[PDB]
Symmetry: C2
């Protein structure tokens, strides 16, 4: 029983590898043939199009960088829908607009197949270890089937509701993350400028009502925590460009649903600014470096 | 050996009571004589001014609502400073501007006494149970002595550095809380308007990178958590007025230290707007209710 995998970037590659570690035969496609060679050298079937993946696999995982790439992989000239068979399970782990997930779902449904959005949180490390969180939207009858596949690539797989709810949960999490990370940077910087030792203030934040994941798990001030990007000049981690993309999705959804987001809008514009100022390739926690005045 | 206590509001009262539970004789003042009657009925000495407290006690705790009330208690016509004895330990648990704490300390020092700022986090519940956090600034030689008193009233007593650093620590914490509470409210509201069950979204936030104290211990959405103000129409807890005050302090300190606070500023103005729109006596988590679309 082969599984299709489309998109083998910094996330898709380790995700696919974890499926192979669980004994799944794979049918592979990426627009970059060089990203496929690694898997071909190891007995996995590499094909020429997403349609060709659907021709040979009744379960497919798509992992793509953008809304546009995702719709191209499904509705494009050689997209999955051109050759998708009845009763096929299609799981999109791309992070995209909830509304686009819904539109995609309506299209696969016309073909008598099932679509589920399952965007991931965790990053390259969790992708490699198989410790990702999947936030899953779609018909709940199909969740159990999906969980069998996703459980091989992630440690938590959560049913969020109907199609697009996975995207919605992920987008809302990351918006709150950005707000709190910037908040942490702002409070730490103010604290230091007020004459506080950063390590002491982190300690106070982390035993008080200010405690958050940003401050206790991913502190943006160099020297406060080991093993976080601020320890290493903001290398790796979760890229500022990626954070800005996610906040763009939050912003678009907030306008669409007429939800007021004062802090979320500002977080978005701040990370947008950072993209234009040389932070695009730095971990998003670099906002502290953006704020602080040496 | 008696301890002075000035200011017996919703925080001062239970704080003073915990000192009595530890065996400390008290010398009391509050501008409201009615707030003193309770302590007089029980064998504590009530006097007529803060100066009169200083005349009889070599260690004094002040617990006042504002910067102005604090400086009046010290520097006023009948303030501590008029009758303070040398070697006196003076601890201000009021939440006030760090720069004002420094000014007070310099004045106290002229009188050969010691000043320490020890603002509290925890609220009337923690005040009552003795589970307050004290964040303490001042000469560190004096911290151990202070900790003996404060430890009777709080479960954590943390040395933050020189005078004003306790105020600094508390102000930075509350700014980050305001930002995160508003953030949680915004993310929850957006989730709900996107069609998510709030309980589910809370669960997701609380197992992910979005998890904060606001979302996992004090969730602003009614029905998500028991035992938080949102389960109770935002009654009690930590008042919006008080959150706005504290953010005012962060704003002023941010200006003074020239620290850019983009989200902290907006958090401040948002809570300011809430105070003028009926929220001032509701718990600060009512920001969710403030964001929510009302039927019309």
């Amino acid at each position: 029983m082969p599984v299709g995998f489309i998109g083998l970037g910094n996330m898709g590659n380790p995700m696919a590898k974890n499926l192979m570690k669980h004994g799944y035969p794979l049918i592979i496609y990426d627009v970059f043939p060089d990203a496929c060679k690694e898997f071909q050298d190891a007995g996995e079937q590499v094909v020429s199009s997403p349609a060709d993946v659907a021709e040979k696999a009744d379960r497919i995982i798509t992992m793509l960088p953008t809304s546009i790439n995702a719709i191209e992989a499904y509705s494009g000239a050689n997209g999955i829908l051109k050759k998708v068979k009845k009763g096929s399970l299609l799981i999109d782990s791309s992070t995209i607009d909830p509304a686009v997930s819904k539109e995609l779902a309506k299209e696969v449904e016309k073909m008598g197949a099932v679509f589920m959005d399952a965007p991931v949180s965790g990053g390259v490390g969790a992708a490699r270890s198989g410790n990702l969180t999947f936030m899953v939207g779609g018909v709940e009858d199909e969740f159990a089937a999906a969980q069998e596949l996703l459980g091989c690539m992630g440690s938590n797989v959560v049913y969020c509701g109907a199609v697009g709810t996975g995207q919605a949960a992920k987008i809302c999490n990351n918006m709150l993350l950005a707000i709190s990370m910037i908040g942490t940077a702002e409070a730490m910087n103010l604290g230091i400028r007020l004459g506080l030792d950063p390590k002491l203030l982190a300690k106070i934040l982390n035993m008080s009502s200010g405690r958050c994941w940003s401050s206790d798990t991913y502190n943006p001030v160099p020297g406060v925590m080991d093993g976080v990007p601020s320890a290493n000049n903001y290398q790796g981690g979760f890229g500022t460009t990626l954070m800005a993309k996610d906040l763009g999705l939050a912003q678009d959804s907030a306008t669409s649903t007429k939800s007021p987001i004062l802090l979320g809008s500002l977080a978005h514009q701040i990370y947008r600014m950072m993209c234009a100022k040389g932070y695009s390739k730095k971990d998003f926690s670099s906002v502290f470096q953006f704020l602080r005045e040496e």
